[PDB]
Amino acid sequence: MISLIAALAVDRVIGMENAMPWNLPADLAWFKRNTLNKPVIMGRHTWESIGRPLPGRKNIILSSQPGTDDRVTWVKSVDEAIAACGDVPEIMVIGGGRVYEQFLPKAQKLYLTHIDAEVEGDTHFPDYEPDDWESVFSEFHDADAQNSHSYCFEILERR
Numbered sequence: 001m002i003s004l005i006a007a008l009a010v011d012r013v014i015g016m017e018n019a020m021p022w023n024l025p026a027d028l029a030w031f032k033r034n035t036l037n038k039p040v041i042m043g044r045h046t047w048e049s050i051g052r053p054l055p056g057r058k059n060i061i062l063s064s065q066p067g068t069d070d071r072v073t074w075v076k077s078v079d080e081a082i083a084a085c086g087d088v089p090e091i092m093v094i095g096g097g098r099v100y101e102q103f104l105p106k107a108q109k110l111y112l113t114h115i116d117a118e119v120e121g122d123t124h125f126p127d128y129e130p131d132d133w134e135s136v137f138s139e140f141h142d143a144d145a146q147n148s149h150s151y152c153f154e155i156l157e158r159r
């Protein structure tokens, strides 16, 4: 099965100038917890945004142009990206906006962090149909000394 994982600010903003304009260590630890020992698929812009391979995961990068780094797997289409994962229980799609748009219809599960931050942005999470999805887990956290915004961890499963 295919799952999406993302962190969204107000108005579904997920990025600005190829960067993440917030710092929530709690949310990054949640990202690691739910992606470790799984394959992760990302587009080339998100790969450049991270700037380095993610340890303990099979990194698969979508790009129409040849790869430039043998520490990861490069693929040229959604179907190849999926096939390159092999037979695993859960494929994690980690963005970005363009990549989210193409994998949303295939996905059975959404790992969404809702961040109470107002952010100008140039990239958005897709406007998914709420009727299609059932919320099966939610966990709200107030801001603290490490996390300057309040946030809500949510898991949605396609009905």
Ligand SMILES: NC(=O)c1ccc[n+]([C@@H]2O[C@H](COP(=O)([O-])OP(=O)(O)OC[C@H]3O[C@@H](n4cnc5c(N)ncnc54)[C@H](OP(=O)(O)O)[C@@H]3O)[C@@H](O)[C@H]2O)c1
Pocket (backbone or CB within 6 Å): 005, 006, 007, 008, 013, 014, 015, 016, 017, 018, 019, 020, 042, 043, 044, 045, 046, 047, 049, 062, 063, 064, 065, 075, 076, 077, 078, 094, 095, 096, 097, 098, 099, 100, 102, 123
């Ligand atoms: N908050 C979050 O959860 C989160 C998560 C991830 C990223 N982000 C943010 O999202 C932004 C980047 O998003 P983005 O939409 O601009 O880029 P993206 O989706 O990360 O990458 C797009 C690139 O991926 C390749 N690609 C996508 N689909 C393909 C296909 N079917 N076949 C071949 N190649 C394909 C293309 O590479 P080529 O141009 O090489 O063909 C395309 O230019 C940044 O601001 C990042 O910080 C946020």
Ligand SMILES: Nc1nc(=O)c2nc(CNc3ccc(C(=O)N[C@@H](CCC(=O)O)C(=O)O)cc3)cnc2[nH]1
Pocket (backbone or CB within 6 Å): 005, 006, 007, 020, 025, 027, 028, 029, 030, 031, 032, 046, 049, 050, 054, 055, 094, 095, 112, 113
């Ligand atoms: N919920 C969520 N939050 C995010 O910040 C996020 N980010 C991306 C893409 N960008 C990034 C940027 C940095 C790291 C990163 O450095 N991760 C380390 C941090 C571990 C930690 O700090 O505990 C990792 O090993 O996963 C991952 C993804 C995709 N999905 C997300 N999903």
Ligand SMILES: [Mn+2]
Pocket (backbone or CB within 6 Å): 011
């Ligand atoms: Mn507004």
Ligand SMILES: [Mn+2]
Pocket (backbone or CB within 6 Å): 070
């Ligand atoms: Mn080689």
Ligand SMILES: [Mn+2]
Pocket (backbone or CB within 6 Å): 086, 087
């Ligand atoms: Mn197979």
Ligand SMILES: [Mn+2]
Pocket (backbone or CB within 6 Å): 116, 117, 118, 148, 149, 150
């Ligand atoms: Mn805030």
Ligand SMILES: [Mn+2]
Pocket (backbone or CB within 6 Å): 101, 126, 127
């Ligand atoms: Mn759309």
Ligand SMILES: [Mn+2]
Pocket (backbone or CB within 6 Å): 130, 131, 132
């Ligand atoms: Mn509804």
